Write a protein that binds this DNA or RNA. Structure first.
Ligand code: MG
Ligand code: MG
Ligand code: MG
Ligand code: MG
Ligand code: MG
Ligand code: MG
Ligand code: MG
Ligand code: MG
Ligand code: MG
Ligand code: MG
Ligand code: MG
Ligand code: MG
Ligand code: MG
Ligand code: MG
Ligand code: MG
Ligand code: MG
Length: 109
RNA sequence: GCGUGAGCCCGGGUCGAACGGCCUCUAGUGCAGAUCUUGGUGGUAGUAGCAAAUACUUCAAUGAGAACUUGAAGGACCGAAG
Protein backbone atom coordinates (compact mmCIF):
# COMPACT_ATOMS: atom_id res chain seq x y z
CA UNK A 1 0.00 0.00 0.00
CA UNK A 2 2.58 2.61 -1.15
CA UNK A 3 1.28 6.22 -0.79
CA UNK A 4 1.26 8.22 -4.07
CA UNK A 5 3.54 10.90 -2.52
CA UNK A 6 6.69 8.85 -1.80
CA UNK A 7 10.42 9.33 -2.34
CA UNK A 8 13.09 6.66 -2.63
CA UNK A 9 16.79 6.52 -3.44
CA UNK A 10 18.13 4.05 -6.00
CA UNK A 11 21.45 3.09 -7.56
CA UNK A 12 21.04 3.00 -11.34
CA UNK A 13 23.61 0.69 -12.92
CA UNK A 14 24.05 2.63 -16.16
CA UNK A 15 27.02 0.48 -17.23
CA UNK A 16 24.90 -2.50 -18.30
CA UNK A 17 22.44 -0.16 -20.03
CA UNK A 18 25.08 1.80 -21.97
CA UNK A 19 27.16 -1.29 -22.79
CA UNK A 20 28.13 -1.11 -26.45
CA UNK A 21 26.24 1.99 -27.58
CA UNK A 22 27.62 4.59 -29.97
CA UNK A 23 29.94 7.09 -28.29
CA UNK A 24 28.07 10.14 -29.59
CA UNK A 25 24.84 8.78 -28.08
CA UNK A 26 26.06 7.63 -24.65
CA UNK A 27 24.92 10.60 -22.55
CA UNK A 28 21.54 11.16 -24.30
CA UNK A 29 20.89 7.43 -24.08
CA UNK A 30 21.74 7.53 -20.37
CA UNK A 31 19.24 10.37 -19.96
CA UNK A 32 16.56 8.30 -21.69
CA UNK A 33 17.49 5.24 -19.62
CA UNK A 34 17.13 7.28 -16.43
CA UNK A 35 13.70 8.46 -17.55
CA UNK A 36 12.67 4.88 -18.36
CA UNK A 37 14.03 3.69 -15.00
CA UNK A 38 11.93 6.27 -13.16
CA UNK A 39 8.93 5.30 -15.29
CA UNK A 40 9.31 1.64 -14.36
CA UNK A 41 9.97 2.38 -10.68
CA UNK A 42 7.11 4.82 -10.03
CA UNK A 43 4.61 3.85 -12.75
CA UNK A 44 4.27 7.55 -13.52
CA UNK A 45 5.26 8.12 -17.21
CA UNK A 46 5.87 11.83 -16.42
CA UNK A 47 9.52 12.07 -15.36
CA UNK A 48 11.40 15.31 -14.76
CA UNK A 49 15.18 15.33 -14.35
CA UNK A 50 16.99 17.82 -12.13
CA UNK A 51 19.54 20.02 -13.94
CA UNK A 52 22.06 18.93 -11.31
CA UNK A 53 21.37 15.34 -12.36
CA UNK A 54 21.90 16.37 -15.99
CA UNK A 55 25.22 17.95 -14.99
CA UNK A 56 26.24 14.75 -13.20
CA UNK A 57 25.36 12.68 -16.27
CA UNK A 58 27.27 14.98 -18.64
CA UNK A 59 30.16 15.62 -16.23
CA UNK A 60 32.70 13.44 -18.08
CA UNK A 61 31.64 14.41 -21.60
CA UNK A 62 29.29 12.74 -24.03
CA UNK A 63 30.82 9.26 -23.58
CA UNK A 64 32.03 9.33 -19.98
CA UNK A 65 28.78 8.48 -18.20
CA UNK A 66 29.43 6.91 -14.77
CA UNK A 67 28.93 3.18 -14.36
CA UNK A 68 26.57 3.70 -11.40
CA UNK A 69 24.63 6.78 -10.32
CA UNK A 70 22.80 7.37 -7.04
CA UNK A 71 19.48 9.16 -7.54
CA UNK A 72 16.48 10.19 -5.48
CA UNK A 73 13.13 9.71 -7.24
CA UNK A 74 10.18 11.51 -5.63
CA UNK A 75 6.68 10.73 -6.86
CA UNK A 76 4.57 13.82 -6.22
CA UNK A 77 1.19 15.26 -7.15
CA UNK A 78 0.78 17.15 -10.41
CA UNK A 79 -1.56 19.95 -9.34
CA UNK A 80 -1.80 21.60 -12.77
CA UNK A 81 -5.42 21.57 -13.92
CA UNK A 82 -4.42 20.67 -17.49
CA UNK A 83 -2.22 17.73 -16.50
CA UNK A 84 -3.04 14.48 -18.29
CA UNK A 85 -1.53 12.54 -15.36
CA UNK A 86 -2.19 13.12 -11.67
CA UNK A 87 1.32 12.13 -10.55
CA UNK A 88 4.85 12.83 -11.75
CA UNK A 89 8.29 11.64 -10.66
CA UNK A 90 11.02 14.22 -10.11
CA UNK A 91 14.48 12.63 -10.00
CA UNK A 92 17.68 14.28 -8.78
CA UNK A 93 21.21 13.19 -7.95
CA UNK A 94 22.29 12.21 -4.44
CA UNK A 95 25.37 13.85 -2.89
CA UNK A 96 27.65 10.83 -2.55
CA UNK A 97 31.29 10.48 -3.57
CA UNK A 98 30.63 6.95 -4.84
CA UNK A 99 27.38 4.97 -5.28
CA UNK A 100 28.84 1.55 -4.41
CA UNK A 101 27.21 -0.72 -1.85
CA UNK A 102 23.92 1.16 -1.41
CA UNK A 103 20.46 -0.39 -1.24
CA UNK A 104 17.16 1.07 -2.39
CA UNK A 105 16.02 3.18 0.55
CA UNK A 106 12.83 5.08 1.33
CA UNK A 107 13.49 8.74 2.15
CA UNK A 108 11.33 10.95 4.36
CA UNK A 109 11.87 14.42 5.82
C1' G B 1 -36.34 3.39 -82.31
C1' C B 2 -34.32 3.65 -87.41
C1' G B 3 -30.12 2.67 -90.98
C1' U B 4 -25.64 -2.84 -93.77
C1' G B 5 -22.73 1.39 -92.27
C1' A B 6 -20.74 6.49 -91.57
C1' G B 7 -24.76 8.24 -88.78
C1' C B 8 -30.10 10.04 -87.63
C1' C B 9 -34.23 10.55 -84.18
C1' C B 10 -36.48 10.21 -79.38
C1' G B 11 -36.92 9.44 -73.48
C1' G B 12 -34.57 11.07 -68.66
C1' G B 13 -30.95 14.43 -66.15
C1' U B 14 -27.94 19.01 -66.24
C1' C B 15 -28.26 23.74 -68.35
C1' G B 16 -29.08 28.64 -69.72
C1' A B 17 -29.93 31.92 -75.49
C1' A B 18 -29.85 30.84 -79.43
C1' C B 19 -30.75 26.78 -83.33
C1' G B 20 -32.33 23.30 -87.08
C1' G B 21 -34.73 20.51 -91.75
C1' C B 22 -35.00 20.86 -97.29
C1' C B 23 -32.54 22.64 -102.56
C1' U B 24 -28.53 25.13 -104.26
C1' C B 25 -23.46 27.82 -103.17
C1' U B 26 -18.79 27.61 -100.49
C1' A B 27 -14.40 25.57 -97.69
C1' G B 28 -8.91 26.53 -93.13
C1' U B 29 -14.68 20.19 -93.67
C1' G B 30 -14.13 14.20 -90.81
C1' C B 31 -7.66 11.52 -86.89
C1' A B 32 -5.11 6.44 -83.14
C1' G B 33 -0.73 6.87 -84.77
C1' A B 34 3.62 11.27 -87.63
C1' U B 35 10.30 9.64 -81.14
C1' C B 36 3.37 14.73 -84.14
C1' U B 37 1.98 20.31 -81.37
C1' U B 38 -0.11 22.54 -76.89
C1' G B 39 -2.43 21.47 -72.32
C1' G B 40 -3.94 18.12 -68.63
C1' U B 41 -3.47 13.41 -65.98
C1' G B 42 -1.71 8.27 -64.50
C1' G B 43 0.98 3.43 -62.92
C1' U B 44 5.69 3.52 -61.01
C1' A B 45 4.65 5.39 -55.54
C1' G B 46 3.77 7.01 -50.25
C1' U B 47 8.47 4.31 -53.70
C1' A B 48 14.20 6.22 -54.73
C1' G B 49 15.27 9.01 -51.19
C1' C B 50 15.90 13.62 -47.47
C1' A B 51 23.29 9.57 -44.56
C1' A B 52 30.14 14.93 -46.29
C1' A B 53 31.42 19.28 -42.79
C1' U B 54 32.50 15.08 -34.72
C1' A B 55 26.66 16.70 -31.02
C1' C B 56 23.75 17.20 -28.44
C1' U B 57 21.34 17.29 -23.20
C1' U B 58 18.40 19.42 -18.57
C1' C B 59 15.02 23.00 -16.57
C1' A B 60 11.99 27.33 -17.52
C1' A B 61 9.31 30.91 -20.42
C1' U B 62 6.27 31.56 -24.99
C1' G B 63 2.67 29.28 -27.74
C1' A B 64 -3.15 25.64 -30.27
C1' G B 65 1.13 23.23 -31.43
C1' A B 66 8.58 23.41 -29.90
C1' A B 67 14.64 18.56 -31.63
C1' C B 68 15.84 22.62 -35.13
C1' U B 69 12.25 30.00 -30.81
C1' U B 70 14.43 32.39 -26.39
C1' G B 71 16.81 32.52 -21.21
C1' A B 72 19.97 29.83 -17.80
C1' A B 73 23.13 25.49 -17.07
C1' G B 74 26.03 21.58 -19.06
C1' G B 75 28.67 19.09 -23.09
C1' A B 76 31.24 20.26 -27.78
C1' C B 77 33.47 22.39 -32.51
C1' C B 78 35.95 26.38 -35.45
C1' G B 79 41.50 26.65 -32.92
C1' A B 80 44.09 32.96 -35.45
C1' A B 81 46.37 30.50 -43.91
C1' G B 82 39.34 30.59 -38.05
MG1 MG C 1 28.96 -3.36 -30.41
MG1 MG D 1 -27.81 34.77 -70.25
MG1 MG E 1 -7.56 20.64 -92.22
MG1 MG F 1 -5.64 12.54 -80.90
MG1 MG G 1 -4.01 5.98 -89.51
MG1 MG H 1 3.12 16.26 -73.70
MG1 MG I 1 5.17 11.89 -64.60
MG1 MG J 1 12.11 4.97 -47.88
MG1 MG K 1 22.56 9.46 -50.23
MG1 MG L 1 18.63 10.08 -41.14
MG1 MG M 1 27.01 15.48 -40.42
MG1 MG N 1 1.92 27.27 -21.86
MG1 MG O 1 20.23 20.28 -33.90
MG1 MG P 1 39.48 19.12 -36.08
MG1 MG Q 1 39.13 21.92 -30.78
MG1 MG R 1 48.87 35.84 -42.95
Amino acid sequence: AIADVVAREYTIHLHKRLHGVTFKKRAPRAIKEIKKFAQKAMGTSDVRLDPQLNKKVWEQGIKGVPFRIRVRISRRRNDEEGAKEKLYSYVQAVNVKNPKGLLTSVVEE
